[PDB]
Design a protein around this nucleic acid. Structure first.
Lengths: 5, 99, 5, 99
DNA sequence: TATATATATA
DNA sequence: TATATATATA
């Protein structure tokens, strides 16, 4: 998954 | 009297992680490999179960999992959340590179 | 409305 | 010098009325119809704009409207409030049986 | 549902 | 200053 920003 | 939360964590530690807009979320302290870009002081690489997303958070947003389990460990309809509850119990090492 | 208090 | 607020009100007066839990609220002193149960001493029947609720309040919780407009006349998210603001300036006579 | 803010009180 | 409660938003 990607960065939870 | 009220026990403080940890101000330091170690890789592999299981927590609840809190970000703005989302419920307290089952999560893990990942490692920060050396020979990489340093993170901002007192921020830990976080792995969220269910979504497998990541972020950097300080201790204020972190709650040790066992201690806060039944205040934060109730089902919730947000995508990934219930899968995350499942993963923090049955597969909390998933994609963990620490050890 | 009614009596509020 | 600090001018005291009225210790006496007449039917028809527009005010801000204060109850616990709520911002100062746009309101009107109603008449007490005689040949009725007499209220507690020095308390007046209050009609709230916006909600059309009623209550009995002494002068200590009453603020002359024109005098305290700018201080209490600002937008507020509470249900009825901005509706009340509209009513105290445009239709202050709603359900008033005083005259 | 289940968040955040607004704005009350303590 | 810190918390509880009402109301908007996602």
């Amino acid at each position: 998954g990607g960065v939870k920003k | 009297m009220a026990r403080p939360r940890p101000r330091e964590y170690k890789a592999g530690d299981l927590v609840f992680a809190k970000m703005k807009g989302y419920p307290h979320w089952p999560a893990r302290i990942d490692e920060l490999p050396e020979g990489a870009v340093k993170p901002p002081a007192n921020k830990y690489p976080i792995f969220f179960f269910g979504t497998h997303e990541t972020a950097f958070l300080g201790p204020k947003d972190l709650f040790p999992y066992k201690e806060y389990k039944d205040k934060f460990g109730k089902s919730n309809k947000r995508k990934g959340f219930n899968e995350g509850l499942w993963e923090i119990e049955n597969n909390p090492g998933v994609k963990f590179t620490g050890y």
